[PDB]
């Protein structure tokens, strides 16, 4: 080929509503039945071979109906992890040798397969295994994943045209090489889009990968692998290993060819990996690149000029969409007294009526918590709230793990302005102490991922944007601080983090390259003496 | 101000030749005399106050004439380091609050002061203290430093306009905030431009800084501080602490407000800092960002189609410019036998005549090694070469530290294709084993920073660019692999490094920011129920 080609221009994928009478609702019912009725083995996918391993069998179930099995995986053994690392290294040369456009076409094809014939299949696997309502599944497993793929192809293509200046008599170029060695992607339960992106973003740039998805997301992870295969992903470029990850990390973190880790999950797990890499630093051929993001909890401050209906809705969605389990959910709200007088009883009444249940009933707002450990952590929190003098349970606080891991939307009233779940703490503050509340928030700002101000008053909005500039990584005005859309709300991260390079911008993709400069000089010097040396 | 302003457009600063009869040569003689005749105290600059501390007095001398003192500094004590950290934190709020254009104007002004009235002053301080010829000083202390400043202002301004997509009904913006806490810049002897850039690049983005320059570069470091002050840098934004750095690191690495380290120097020193930060990780408010670059040694391969005069000149300049002490110098050359027959005696004859001496005689090609430790390391290397069976000293190998730290340009012939100084090892290989030599190089490629191929044959050039793609971070065709110019040859780094974010591109400046997204929604939802929930 003699060409300087351009990739298709990305736009965000439209979100389907699955309203009654819509055709996508019919298709979704069909896929929900198909997956829930035919539970399957969920194998490792190594070198293109789908195989169960010799580790412990672990059932993947519907969290909202936990006796209902969706499939069964095997806990990866050391042998399975070693096979995945070898397959990733054996696939590297043919994959890195493919031209960029052929690598990009796999992910553009995967995007259009997910937008069209696989759409409800992947949305249903996510609803079932992760206990997401259809809306929560549509924005995540379908739209966000599609946009990661289309946008990362466009961001990669933008990176490749960033080229230097050529002086007279020379030509300077930059080549964005892939890394040496394999990348290890470790992905969380809560987003099928993150789970698909972490391994595929480095692959787009010519790397190969071993991918360890969260057990409770593995139905959608495996269907994602099938989809990628259907798009033409060559065997071994991504290798899926199932289970709790412990034997995989034993192998991967000991291998000298480890080039990077792409991680999203808890700070505790990230810290363990970072320590391990550091301890082993002397054995790696390359300095391993550790990239990703950890969670946090978000706050909302409503000024006396807040619209009460906007605030009520932002709080209900922000705290209770996907049962509070989004990488960030609204956990703490600070509301001016005069606004609480206008919307406080309505918030508690709507929270008390909010329906959580089996998400194959599309009328439910949401489902259950992801697994028994999450449920235990939520019960411990609610019982701590009931026993703490500073907090009252205003609505909710009931829980029952008999059918599914169900916890009710809970609103706590906290008299003192000083784990994921459907819990919201509200502190009501006198209207004239808005600036003082902003100070309190800033002083308590360690695990602050996102913040929002609700205020029609422009001075109040600017005061919040300024006073809390360093107190949160993403800031929202008159909306809930949840729901970031690829291309639209990149960046942030908790205060003090170094996560500018997380997914959603070209800076992530650059982490999976090692740029070299190439300089050709056309008529270089043929005498070494310099002008200053002359006599004189 | 109501404006969206644009910065001046950068171009590379022209290099003056200081040929006989030129006016800059006259001005340089005057500054050489002024600095060499009036040695000064070289103080810490903390909070804008220039002061000697209570640590050991250490003389800074002319390396090519080491009895000639240029100044005297004091080894920073723990108290001096603590004052620098406090001054950097006390200056932060007024500096971060200045608009970008006012911060940028300090560095654009500093650039035009260095291009014009301070030009020969800073070139002379670098020649004197670092033993650079006027050419070596002009490309480094003058042109490279000017270009870092002008180009980083342009790169910063490009970063600030990278903004997201706004969907219907919302406005998304990104704010590139400075870091929290101070940045610690630690800078090497060999480049006055690196030494000026490391502390000023994070300052441009609204940070404040403590800067620990190398002892042997401190005359030019202090004159650089004066220049920045003359440009309007506000007191405390950069704080210069002199000496060996050990008490500074004791204080800085223990302080919870450490936000980053900008380092250039040896891998041994970088590893010590990285370990220390890791050990202390739990005390910092932010995860400290460690950024910089380490050295390496470069190789040149000449194919049988190499022009012999280009190759001879590239080798003499590449190995012997600035006595081999550039962050990368040509240490190893692999030359086809037929080309060695044509240029080998001329290379040894020109190396034997190359004049190293006091660089205030402008007729010298170069000067001395930087200090006694460098000289000892070069003697140990030459004596190891004389005793090793695999290596013959072909020309040079003489040394004498009686006047200055002088080591002659040395060419070693190595029969086996298997520290900074003027030493070049040449392996002569039969013409038809070009591809095999490329394999050898790739297999020995751990500390490979830069590589060059000399070949008029296009197939040979492409073979080198391909086979050695991963064997070096910067690659040169028909020129010496030394001398990278800002804007023209960014990136690279040794094989396996993670240094895409080093100085010379906008990616470095992004390391000194923490981007947040701000989303305003104009007409957010006032009912929390979703379309899918309807009955049906
Ligand atoms: O809950 P969440 O999913 O949000 O966050 P989490 O941090 O508990 O888990 C995120 C992911 O990391 C995995 N994991 C945890 N420890 C691991 C280790 N030591 N080695 C490899 N993988 C590991 C989990 O199984 C999951 O895939
Ligand atoms: O020789 P070169 O200048 O190329 O490389 P080098 O790595 O020896 O030194 C580069 C710089 O690091 C400084 N340094 C070394 N150890 C240090 C420490 N422990 N704490 C703070 N600063 C330290 C040096 O004095 C110099 O400023």
CSV table of N, CA, C and O in Angstrom, one decimal, chain A residues 351-421:
chain,number,residue,atom,x,y,z
A,351,UNK,N,-37.0,7.1,47.6
A,351,UNK,CA,-36.1,6.0,48.0
A,351,UNK,C,-36.8,4.8,48.6
A,351,UNK,O,-36.4,3.7,48.3
A,352,UNK,N,-37.8,5.1,49.3
A,352,UNK,CA,-38.5,4.0,50.0
A,352,UNK,C,-39.3,3.1,49.0
A,352,UNK,O,-39.4,1.9,49.2
A,353,UNK,N,-39.7,3.8,47.9
A,353,UNK,CA,-40.5,3.1,46.8
A,353,UNK,C,-39.6,2.5,45.7
A,353,UNK,O,-40.1,1.9,44.8
A,354,UNK,N,-38.3,2.8,45.7
A,354,UNK,CA,-37.5,2.3,44.7
A,354,UNK,C,-37.4,0.8,44.6
A,354,UNK,O,-37.2,0.2,45.6
A,355,UNK,N,-37.6,0.2,43.5
A,355,UNK,CA,-37.7,-1.2,43.3
A,355,UNK,C,-36.4,-1.8,42.9
A,355,UNK,O,-36.0,-1.6,41.8
A,356,UNK,N,-35.9,-2.7,43.8
A,356,UNK,CA,-34.7,-3.5,43.5
A,356,UNK,C,-35.2,-4.9,43.4
A,356,UNK,O,-35.9,-5.4,44.3
A,357,UNK,N,-34.8,-5.7,42.4
A,357,UNK,CA,-35.3,-7.1,42.3
A,357,UNK,C,-34.6,-7.8,41.2
A,357,UNK,O,-33.5,-7.4,40.7
A,358,UNK,N,-35.2,-8.9,40.7
A,358,UNK,CA,-34.6,-9.6,39.6
A,358,UNK,C,-34.7,-8.7,38.3
A,358,UNK,O,-35.7,-8.1,37.9
A,359,UNK,N,-33.5,-8.5,37.7
A,359,UNK,CA,-33.5,-7.5,36.6
A,359,UNK,C,-34.0,-8.0,35.3
A,359,UNK,O,-34.1,-7.2,34.2
A,360,UNK,N,-34.5,-9.3,35.3
A,360,UNK,CA,-35.2,-9.7,34.1
A,360,UNK,C,-36.6,-9.2,34.1
A,360,UNK,O,-37.3,-9.3,33.1
A,361,UNK,N,-37.1,-8.6,35.3
A,361,UNK,CA,-38.3,-7.8,35.2
A,361,UNK,C,-37.9,-6.4,35.0
A,361,UNK,O,-37.2,-5.8,35.9
A,362,UNK,N,-38.2,-5.9,33.8
A,362,UNK,CA,-37.6,-4.6,33.3
A,362,UNK,C,-38.2,-3.5,34.1
A,362,UNK,O,-37.8,-2.3,34.0
A,363,UNK,N,-39.3,-3.7,34.8
A,363,UNK,CA,-39.9,-2.6,35.6
A,363,UNK,C,-39.0,-2.3,36.9
A,363,UNK,O,-39.2,-1.2,37.5
A,364,UNK,N,-38.1,-3.1,37.3
A,364,UNK,CA,-37.2,-2.9,38.5
A,364,UNK,C,-36.3,-1.7,38.1
A,364,UNK,O,-35.8,-1.6,37.0
A,365,UNK,N,-35.9,-0.9,39.1
A,365,UNK,CA,-35.0,0.2,39.0
A,365,UNK,C,-33.6,-0.4,38.9
A,365,UNK,O,-32.7,0.1,38.3
A,366,UNK,N,-33.4,-1.4,39.7
A,366,UNK,CA,-32.1,-2.1,39.8
A,366,UNK,C,-32.2,-3.5,40.4
A,366,UNK,O,-33.3,-4.0,40.6
A,367,UNK,N,-31.1,-4.1,40.6
A,367,UNK,CA,-30.9,-5.4,41.1
A,367,UNK,C,-30.3,-5.6,42.5
A,367,UNK,O,-30.6,-4.9,43.4
A,368,UNK,N,-29.4,-6.6,42.6
A,368,UNK,CA,-28.8,-7.0,43.9
A,368,UNK,C,-27.3,-6.6,44.0
A,368,UNK,O,-26.8,-6.2,43.0
A,369,UNK,N,-26.7,-6.7,45.1
A,369,UNK,CA,-25.2,-6.5,45.2
A,369,UNK,C,-24.6,-7.7,44.6
A,369,UNK,O,-25.2,-8.8,44.4
A,370,UNK,N,-23.3,-7.5,44.2
A,370,UNK,CA,-22.7,-8.4,43.3
A,370,UNK,C,-22.4,-9.8,43.9
A,370,UNK,O,-22.5,-10.9,43.1
A,371,UNK,N,-22.1,-9.9,45.2
A,371,UNK,CA,-21.7,-11.2,45.7
A,371,UNK,C,-21.8,-11.2,47.3
A,371,UNK,O,-22.2,-10.1,47.8
A,372,UNK,N,-21.7,-12.3,47.9
A,372,UNK,CA,-21.9,-12.4,49.4
A,372,UNK,C,-20.9,-11.5,50.1
A,372,UNK,O,-21.3,-10.9,51.1
A,373,UNK,N,-19.7,-11.4,49.7
A,373,UNK,CA,-18.8,-10.5,50.4
A,373,UNK,C,-19.3,-9.0,50.3
A,373,UNK,O,-19.2,-8.3,51.4
A,374,UNK,N,-19.7,-8.6,49.2
A,374,UNK,CA,-20.3,-7.2,49.1
A,374,UNK,C,-21.5,-7.1,50.0
A,374,UNK,O,-21.8,-6.0,50.6
A,375,UNK,N,-22.3,-8.2,50.1
A,375,UNK,CA,-23.5,-8.0,50.9
A,375,UNK,C,-23.1,-7.9,52.4
A,375,UNK,O,-23.7,-7.1,53.1
A,376,UNK,N,-22.2,-8.7,52.8
A,376,UNK,CA,-21.7,-8.7,54.2
A,376,UNK,C,-21.2,-7.3,54.6
A,376,UNK,O,-21.5,-6.7,55.6
A,377,UNK,N,-20.4,-6.7,53.6
A,377,UNK,CA,-19.8,-5.3,53.8
A,377,UNK,C,-20.9,-4.3,54.0
A,377,UNK,O,-20.8,-3.4,54.8
A,378,UNK,N,-22.0,-4.5,53.2
A,378,UNK,CA,-23.2,-3.6,53.3
A,378,UNK,C,-24.0,-3.7,54.6
A,378,UNK,O,-24.4,-2.7,55.3
A,379,UNK,N,-24.2,-5.0,55.0
A,379,UNK,CA,-24.9,-5.2,56.3
A,379,UNK,C,-24.0,-4.6,57.4
A,379,UNK,O,-24.6,-3.9,58.3
A,380,UNK,N,-22.7,-4.8,57.4
A,380,UNK,CA,-21.7,-4.3,58.5
A,380,UNK,C,-21.9,-2.8,58.5
A,380,UNK,O,-22.0,-2.2,59.6
A,381,UNK,N,-22.0,-2.2,57.3
A,381,UNK,CA,-22.1,-0.7,57.3
A,381,UNK,C,-23.4,-0.2,57.8
A,381,UNK,O,-23.4,0.8,58.5
A,382,UNK,N,-24.5,-0.9,57.5
A,382,UNK,CA,-25.8,-0.4,58.0
A,382,UNK,C,-25.9,-0.7,59.5
A,382,UNK,O,-26.5,0.2,60.2
A,383,UNK,N,-25.3,-1.8,60.0
A,383,UNK,CA,-25.4,-2.0,61.4
A,383,UNK,C,-24.5,-1.0,62.1
A,383,UNK,O,-24.9,-0.5,63.2
A,384,UNK,N,-23.4,-0.6,61.6
A,384,UNK,CA,-22.5,0.5,62.1
A,384,UNK,C,-23.3,1.8,62.2
A,384,UNK,O,-23.2,2.5,63.2
A,385,UNK,N,-24.0,2.1,61.1
A,385,UNK,CA,-24.8,3.3,61.1
A,385,UNK,C,-25.9,3.3,62.1
A,385,UNK,O,-26.1,4.3,62.8
A,386,UNK,N,-26.6,2.2,62.3
A,386,UNK,CA,-27.7,2.1,63.3
A,386,UNK,C,-27.0,2.3,64.7
A,386,UNK,O,-27.6,3.1,65.5
A,387,UNK,N,-25.8,1.8,65.0
A,387,UNK,CA,-25.2,1.9,66.3
A,387,UNK,C,-24.4,3.2,66.5
A,387,UNK,O,-24.1,3.6,67.7
A,388,UNK,N,-24.2,4.0,65.5
A,388,UNK,CA,-23.4,5.3,65.6
A,388,UNK,C,-24.3,6.4,66.0
A,388,UNK,O,-25.5,6.5,65.6
A,389,UNK,N,-23.9,7.2,67.0
A,389,UNK,CA,-24.7,8.3,67.5
A,389,UNK,C,-24.8,9.4,66.4
A,389,UNK,O,-25.9,10.1,66.4
A,390,UNK,N,-23.8,9.6,65.6
A,390,UNK,CA,-23.8,10.7,64.6
A,390,UNK,C,-24.7,10.5,63.5
A,390,UNK,O,-25.0,11.5,62.7
A,391,UNK,N,-25.2,9.3,63.3
A,391,UNK,CA,-26.0,8.9,62.1
A,391,UNK,C,-27.4,8.3,62.4
A,391,UNK,O,-27.4,7.4,63.3
A,392,UNK,N,-28.5,8.8,61.8
A,392,UNK,CA,-29.8,8.2,61.9
A,392,UNK,C,-30.2,7.5,60.6
A,392,UNK,O,-30.0,8.1,59.5
A,393,UNK,N,-30.7,6.3,60.6
A,393,UNK,CA,-31.3,5.7,59.3
A,393,UNK,C,-32.6,6.3,59.0
A,393,UNK,O,-33.6,6.1,59.8
A,394,UNK,N,-32.7,7.1,58.0
A,394,UNK,CA,-34.0,7.8,57.7
A,394,UNK,C,-35.0,7.0,56.8
A,394,UNK,O,-36.2,7.2,57.0
A,395,UNK,N,-34.4,6.2,55.9
A,395,UNK,CA,-35.3,5.4,55.1
A,395,UNK,C,-34.4,4.2,54.8
A,395,UNK,O,-33.1,4.3,54.7
A,396,UNK,N,-35.0,3.0,54.6
A,396,UNK,CA,-34.2,1.8,54.2
A,396,UNK,C,-33.4,1.1,55.3
A,396,UNK,O,-33.9,1.0,56.4
A,397,UNK,N,-32.3,0.5,54.9
A,397,UNK,CA,-31.5,-0.2,55.9
A,397,UNK,C,-31.9,-1.6,56.0
A,397,UNK,O,-31.3,-2.3,56.7
A,398,UNK,N,-32.9,-2.1,55.2
A,398,UNK,CA,-33.3,-3.5,55.3
A,398,UNK,C,-32.5,-4.3,54.3
A,398,UNK,O,-32.0,-3.7,53.3
A,399,UNK,N,-32.3,-5.6,54.5
A,399,UNK,CA,-31.4,-6.4,53.7
A,399,UNK,C,-31.8,-7.9,53.8
A,399,UNK,O,-32.4,-8.3,54.9
A,400,UNK,N,-31.6,-8.7,52.8
A,400,UNK,CA,-32.0,-10.1,52.8
A,400,UNK,C,-31.3,-10.8,51.7
A,400,UNK,O,-31.4,-10.5,50.6
A,401,UNK,N,-30.5,-11.8,52.1
A,401,UNK,CA,-29.7,-12.6,51.1
A,401,UNK,C,-30.3,-14.0,50.8
A,401,UNK,O,-29.7,-14.8,50.4
A,402,UNK,N,-31.6,-14.1,51.0
A,402,UNK,CA,-32.3,-15.4,50.9
A,402,UNK,C,-32.5,-15.8,49.4
A,402,UNK,O,-32.4,-16.9,49.1
A,403,UNK,N,-32.9,-14.8,48.6
A,403,UNK,CA,-33.1,-15.0,47.1
A,403,UNK,C,-31.9,-14.5,46.3
A,403,UNK,O,-31.3,-15.2,45.5
A,404,UNK,N,-31.5,-13.3,46.6
A,404,UNK,CA,-30.4,-12.6,46.0
A,404,UNK,C,-29.8,-11.7,47.0
A,404,UNK,O,-30.2,-11.7,48.1
A,405,UNK,N,-28.7,-11.1,46.7
A,405,UNK,CA,-27.9,-10.3,47.6
A,405,UNK,C,-28.5,-8.9,47.8
A,405,UNK,O,-28.0,-7.9,47.4
A,406,UNK,N,-29.7,-8.8,48.3
A,406,UNK,CA,-30.5,-7.6,48.2
A,406,UNK,C,-30.3,-6.7,49.4
A,406,UNK,O,-30.5,-7.1,50.6
A,407,UNK,N,-30.0,-5.4,49.1
A,407,UNK,CA,-29.9,-4.4,50.2
A,407,UNK,C,-30.8,-3.2,49.7
A,407,UNK,O,-30.6,-2.8,48.5
A,408,UNK,N,-31.7,-2.7,50.5
A,408,UNK,CA,-32.5,-1.6,50.1
A,408,UNK,C,-31.8,-0.2,50.0
A,408,UNK,O,-30.8,0.0,50.7
A,409,UNK,N,-32.2,0.6,49.1
A,409,UNK,CA,-31.7,2.0,49.1
A,409,UNK,C,-31.8,2.6,50.5
A,409,UNK,O,-32.9,2.4,51.1
A,410,UNK,N,-30.8,3.1,51.0
A,410,UNK,CA,-30.7,3.6,52.4
A,410,UNK,C,-30.3,5.0,52.4
A,410,UNK,O,-29.2,5.3,51.8
A,411,UNK,N,-31.0,5.8,53.2
A,411,UNK,CA,-30.6,7.3,53.4
A,411,UNK,C,-30.3,7.4,54.8
A,411,UNK,O,-31.2,7.1,55.7
A,412,UNK,N,-29.1,7.9,55.1
A,412,UNK,CA,-28.7,8.2,56.5
A,412,UNK,C,-28.6,9.7,56.7
A,412,UNK,O,-28.3,10.4,55.7
A,413,UNK,N,-29.2,10.2,57.8
A,413,UNK,CA,-29.0,11.6,58.2
A,413,UNK,C,-27.9,11.8,59.1
A,413,UNK,O,-27.8,11.1,60.2
A,414,UNK,N,-26.9,12.6,58.7
A,414,UNK,CA,-25.7,12.8,59.5
A,414,UNK,C,-25.7,14.2,60.1
A,414,UNK,O,-25.9,15.1,59.4
A,415,UNK,N,-25.5,14.3,61.4
A,415,UNK,CA,-25.5,15.5,62.0
A,415,UNK,C,-24.1,16.2,62.0
A,415,UNK,O,-24.0,17.3,62.2
A,416,UNK,N,-23.1,15.5,61.6
A,416,UNK,CA,-21.8,16.0,61.6
A,416,UNK,C,-21.2,16.1,60.2
A,416,UNK,O,-21.1,15.1,59.5
A,417,UNK,N,-20.9,17.4,59.7
A,417,UNK,CA,-20.4,17.4,58.3
A,417,UNK,C,-19.1,16.7,58.2
A,417,UNK,O,-18.6,16.5,57.1
A,418,UNK,N,-18.5,16.1,59.2
A,418,UNK,CA,-17.5,15.1,59.1
A,418,UNK,C,-18.1,13.7,58.9
A,418,UNK,O,-17.4,12.7,58.5
A,419,UNK,N,-16.7,1.0,50.8
A,419,UNK,CA,-17.3,-0.1,50.2
A,419,UNK,C,-18.6,0.3,49.5
A,419,UNK,O,-19.3,1.2,50.0
A,420,UNK,N,-18.8,-0.3,48.3
A,420,UNK,CA,-19.8,0.1,47.4
A,420,UNK,C,-21.2,-0.4,47.8
A,420,UNK,O,-21.3,-1.6,48.2
A,421,UNK,N,-22.2,0.4,47.7
A,421,UNK,CA,-23.5,0.0,48.0
A,421,UNK,C,-24.5,1.1,48.0
A,421,UNK,O,-24.2,2.2,47.8
